[PDB]
């Protein structure tokens, strides 16, 4: 991308018929860390005491 900073901007051009032929995907996809870090029924806000 002739460079913004940490932004790689790519035009993936597949020359073949099957999508599997395309090169690797460069998108950043959504991160939901809280399904692993906060996997609890009741949210615990940072400023609260956790138990009770």
């Amino acid at each position: 991308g002739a460079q913004g900073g940490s932004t790689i901007n790519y035009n993936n051009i597949n020359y073949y018929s099957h999508a599997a032929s395309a090169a690797q995907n460069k998108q950043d996809f959504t991160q939901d860390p809280s399904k692993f870090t906060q996997p609890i029924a009741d949210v615990i806000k940072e400023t609260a005491v956790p138990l009770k």
Binding site: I13, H18, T30, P33
Partner: protein, 242 residues
């Protein structure tokens, strides 16, 4: 034909190439993607999950017991509980954790780290603990008076069983080297010290266990990242697997 000039790098195979390539089964139609819980898009979602430090790495301790730092009733004031060189590389206790094992695959790191400690003594067992982070330049702090001069939290044992010492990203540069490669002087990237001290003492009712434990846990903060993939040192083989 269109006139061309193939240049240098013709016919090479680079393992990190990003090129399209002909599909050997161009008519295949894969099975649909179904919903599965826990989809991961980025390995820093794993690095932000707490894992247990193999913190009791004393010679002779084997198995599950390497995960519990001893904490005892002291007969002297201001004693030291624990000492740990802040390092994502090498082979010390951080190296076998989730964050440490991810760091084995990377060359460089940046960001804040947090250490969560859980006390395991009886309900009736009390104590106060000082957890210190010393930025680099010197040695491990020798006494609690010297360690307190750094970043530190003071932990009171109670109903809330656990504490966090956030080790903040304090650094001359935007990134550090994961490894401690000697020939390359990567000790340049020394990242400081973590020490644990008795702030008062562990106190027990008569005839209770005079020894309890801390389970140390570590994870990355949301400001953390890794660069440069590299081979994992301790995942080797001498033969093809059969």
């Amino acid at each position: 034909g269109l006139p061309t000039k193939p240049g240098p790098g013709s016919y090479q195979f680079m393992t990190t190439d990003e090129d399209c390539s002909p599909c050997i089964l161009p008519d295949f139609q894969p099975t649909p993607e179904i919903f599965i819980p826990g989809k991961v898009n980025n390995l820093l979602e794993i690095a932000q999950v707490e894992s247990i430090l193999e913190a009791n790495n004393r010679e002779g301790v084997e198995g599950v017991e390497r995960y519990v730092i001893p904490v005892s009733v002291q007969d002297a004031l201001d004693a030291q509980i624990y000492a740990l060189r802040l390092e994502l590389g090498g082979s010390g206790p951080l190296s076998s954790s989730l964050l440490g094992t991810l760091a084995k695959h990377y060359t460089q790191w940046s960001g804040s780290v947090e250490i969560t400690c859980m006390f395991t003594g009886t309900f009736m067992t009390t104590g106060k603990v000082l957890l210190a982070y010393t930025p680099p330049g010197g040695d491990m702090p020798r006494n609690r008076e010297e360690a307190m001069l750094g970043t530190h939290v003071i932990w009171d044992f109670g109903l809330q069983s656990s504490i966090t010492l956030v080790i903040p990203w304090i650094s001359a540069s935007h990134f550090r080297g994961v490894s401690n490669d000697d020939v390359l002087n990567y000790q340049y990237y020394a990242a400081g010290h973590v020490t644990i001290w008795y702030q008062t003492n562990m106190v027990i009712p008569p005839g209770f266990p005079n020894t309890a434990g801390i389970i140390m846990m570590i994870a990355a903060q949301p400001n953390f990242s890794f660069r440069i993939q590299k081979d994992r040192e301790d995942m080797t083989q001498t033969a093809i697997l059969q």
